[PDB]
Design a protein around this ligand. Structure first.
Ligand SMILES: *[C@@H]1O[C@H](CO[C@@H]2O[C@@H](C)[C@@H](O)[C@@H](O)[C@@H]2O)[C@@H](O[C@@H]2O[C@H](CO)[C@@H](O[C@@H]3O[C@H](CO)[C@@H](O)[C@H](O)[C@@H]3O)[C@H](O)[C@H]2NC(C)=O)[C@H](O)[C@H]1NC(C)=O
Ligand SMILES: *[C@@H]1O[C@H](CO)[C@@H](O)[C@H](O)[C@H]1NC(C)=O
Ligand SMILES: *[C@H]1O[C@H](CO)[C@H](O)[C@H](O)[C@H]1NC(C)=O
Ligand SMILES: [Cl-]
Lengths: 223, 214, 213
């Protein structure tokens, strides 16, 4: 099946140009009936169409954004991109790419990317500081124990946290961040593991802050 | 035991001439609706995307989602002008003056119906009387039938001897399209696409055909 | 121009049937195909209905779309309702040379059983102490309904300064989670006998304690 993947900068200064890209796999762009589309969801708002492009090169964009929008297809035919100029805070949103089936007035979006959050702000990016949250068998079902990571003082959202490079997924729980009065975020991620393994198995949390190009791989040692 | 033949498939860059149907300088009166055969071409609907502020598009007997994968022996494009409040009649199983006396889609219809408002083209403030429809007929039309007789209608009991008058009407009414009307009485251009698949080699395919050549 | 309007929220009990309507203005919704998208927080939106009433493979027959021209509406209907059906649902169509989305409806599946919270309390790591900060981390999860109160103690006295607490939010399993952070200096942390995180939910209390070394 075709699969869509956004990617682009977490943070954009007000009045500059947002640039995103969709990478298409399992398929390629061609003059086969399908269009290639950007949409977005602003915070507390609903889904909002931006524009789409057909391989003929014809574009159609949302009237309320049309002046600032420009969509294009890469000559490899495995990517298309979005440019949105003169952004303000009102353009802060999760931006989605999608495939669109388009016939006269029938447009059906499917499948969608997972979205990438874009923040319009005058502030600068700050990477996180990561601290171990060391084993406590004082709270969990039995032959089991909880350990974790404290992801502290970063901006903007989001941070990504996997454990053992993604090999560890059962028991992972990443909590919604707190937004400090400072204006920075913090969150925690915790994993539940078998206590017999605590001596013979290494637990690492992998923190990725894409906005600051910061990665931290913190080993959580039993205290 | 049957065959499936590509001997008459189209060149992939040879797109169906839908645009020429849609931007015709003048459309037919609905009583004399006009039909155009479309064949030996790829049915890529991008050629009329956003061609006008379309009002309605619905398909019957085929799913628009599957269309681009599909092939046909022919497509038939019928086009005419009707009143705003009559568009709902260009569908299977309707009644009213347009569906009974002018243009009747069959119950097993396989095809789509596109309509758009064309006030800014088809209505003079003097009033465009050139567009007509048939008000009176002795009986309902059969599916896809056409009637272009201008015989005086005998509403009453006394023969009319071909002369109009009390209970003897000309059977065609004009729309007198003036731009100030309600949308229900404004002119809408309509295009009905028929998708036909006989037991013969197909000559029209959706743009999905285009991927094989890569 | 052509707009589609949905109610902001709808709710129903598991096993019952709920309907979400989508009402047009400045246009006839029966004139152009309507789609329905399901959107779970944190996930790609997906399709439950296209072409007014067609179901993609994988979408159960409990979902069904209908159109009603007499009231100029479109309806998504969900029967044999499940807690995993909680999501925002959007209708979408086209009109006046523009893609048109309804504003969305949040669906809430009620009658869920009450679930008590799990509290895990972590002390400052030695490395955070070496960086002249001290954070106590209180993680609360798996409770329902989504209402907790969190209160902190130094020794036996209430601590109100330096507390950041989240409001509850649903996990993937349809229970709620929350976290609470207490900020000390390393000198405060080292100078008390203990600190305590006390979580209250539906009239019950859990209290966990930690102490230096
Ligand atoms: C697919 O396309 C080919 C040819 O495509 C040609 O090049 C394109 C870039 C476009 O410019 C096309 O318009 C153009 O035709 C079609 O084949 C062609 O068929 C005609 C007959 O119908 C051939 O004409 C012949 O030409 C000689 C030259 O003196 C005459 O004396 C003959 O009497 C005869 O009419 C033409 O040569 C031929 N072209 C090629 C390259 O074979 C083909 O029909 C089309 N496929 C379909 C399904 O329509
Ligand atoms: C209709 O279609 C094509 C556009 O490429 C052209 O041949 C013709 O001039 C068009 N008609 C008008 C009135 O523009
Ligand atoms: C298949 O091929 C034969 C030739 O042997 C005939 O043209 C027949 O009518 C074909 N059938 C179809 C459905 O294309
Ligand atoms: Cl205090």
């Amino acid at each position: 099946q075709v699969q869509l993947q956004e990617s682009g900068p977490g943070l954009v200064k007000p009045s500059q140009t947002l640039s995103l890209t969709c990478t298409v796999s399992g398929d390629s762009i061609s003059s086969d009936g399908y269009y290639w589309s950007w949409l977005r969801q602003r915070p507390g708002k609903g889904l909002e169409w931006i524009g789409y492009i057909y391989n003929s090169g014809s574009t159609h964009y949302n009237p309320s954004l049309n002046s600032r929008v420009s969509i294009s297809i890469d000559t490899s035919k495995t990517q298309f991109s979005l440019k949105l100029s003169s952004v303000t805070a009102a353009d802060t949103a999760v931006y989605y790419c999608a495939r669109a089936l388009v016939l006269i007035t029938y447009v059906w979006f499917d499948p969608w990317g997972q979205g990438t959050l874009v923040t319009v702000s005058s502030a600068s990016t700050k990477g996180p500081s990561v601290f171990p949250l060391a084993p406590s068998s004082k709270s969990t079902s039995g032959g089991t124990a909880a350990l974790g990571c404290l992801v502290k003082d970063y901006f903007p959202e989001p941070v990504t946290v996997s454990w053992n490079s993604g090999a560890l997924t059962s028991g992972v729980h990443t909590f919604p961040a707190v937004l400090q009065s400072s204006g920075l975020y913090s969150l925690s991620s915790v994993v539940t593991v078998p206590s017999s393994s605590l001596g013979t198995q290494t637990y690492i949390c992998n923190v990725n802050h894409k906005p600051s190009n910061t990665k931290v791989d913190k080993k959580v040692e039993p205290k | 035991q049957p065959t499936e033949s590509i001997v008459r498939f189209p060149n992939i860059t040879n797109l169906c001439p839908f645009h020429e149907v849609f931007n015709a300088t003048t459309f037919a009166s609905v009583y004399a609706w006009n039909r155009k055969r479309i064949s030996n071409c790829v049915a890529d609907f991008s050629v009329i995307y956003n061609f006008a502020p379309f009002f309605a598009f619905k398909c019957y007997g085929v799913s628009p989602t599957k269309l681009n994968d599909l092939c046909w022996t022919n497509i038939y494009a019928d086009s005419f002008v009707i009143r705003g409040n009559e568009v709902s009649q260009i569908a299977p199983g309707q009644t009213g003056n347009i569906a009974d006396y002018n243009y009747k889609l069959p119950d097993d219809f396989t095809g789509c119906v596109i309509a758009w408002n064309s006030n800014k083209l088809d209505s003079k403030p003097s009033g465009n009387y050139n567009y007509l429809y048939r008000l009176f007929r002795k009986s309902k039309l059969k599916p896809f039938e056409r009637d272009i007789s201008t015989e005086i209608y005998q509403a009453g009991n006394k023969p009319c001897n071909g002369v109009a008058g009390p209970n003897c009407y000309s059977p065609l009414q004009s729309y007198g399209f003036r731009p100030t009307y309600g949308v229900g009485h404004q002119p809408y251009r309509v295009v009905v696409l028929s998708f036909e698949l006989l037991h013969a080699p197909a000559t029209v395919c959706g743009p999905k055909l285009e991927v094989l050549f890569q | 121009n052509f707009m589609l309007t949905q109610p902001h929220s709808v709710s129903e009990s598991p096993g019952k049937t709920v309907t979400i309507s989508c009402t047009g203005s400045s246009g006839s919704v029966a004139s152009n195909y309507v789609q329905w998208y399901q959107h779970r927080p944190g996930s790609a939106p997906t399709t439950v209905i296209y072409e007014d009433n067609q179901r993609p493979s994988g979408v159960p027959d409990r979902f069904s779309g209908s159109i009603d021209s007499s009231s100029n509406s479109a309806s998504l209907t969900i029967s044999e309702l499940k807690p995993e059906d909680e999501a925002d649902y959007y209708c979408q169509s086209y009109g006046d040379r523009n893609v048109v989305f309804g504003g969305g409806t949040k669906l809430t599946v009620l009658g869920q059983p009450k679930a008590a919270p799990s509290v895990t309390l972590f002390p400052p790591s030695s490395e955070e102490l070496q960086a002249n900060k001290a954070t106590l981390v209180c993680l609360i999860s798996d409770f329902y309904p989504g209402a907790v109160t969190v209160a902190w103690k130094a020794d036996s006295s209430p601590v109100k300064a330096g507390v950041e607490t989240t409001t509850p939010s649903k996990q993937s399993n349809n229970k709620y989670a929350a976290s609470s952070y207490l900020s000390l200096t390393p000198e405060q942390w080292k100078s008390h006998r203990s600190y305590s995180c006390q979580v209250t939910h539906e009239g019950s209390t859990v209290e966990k304690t930690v102490a230096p070394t």
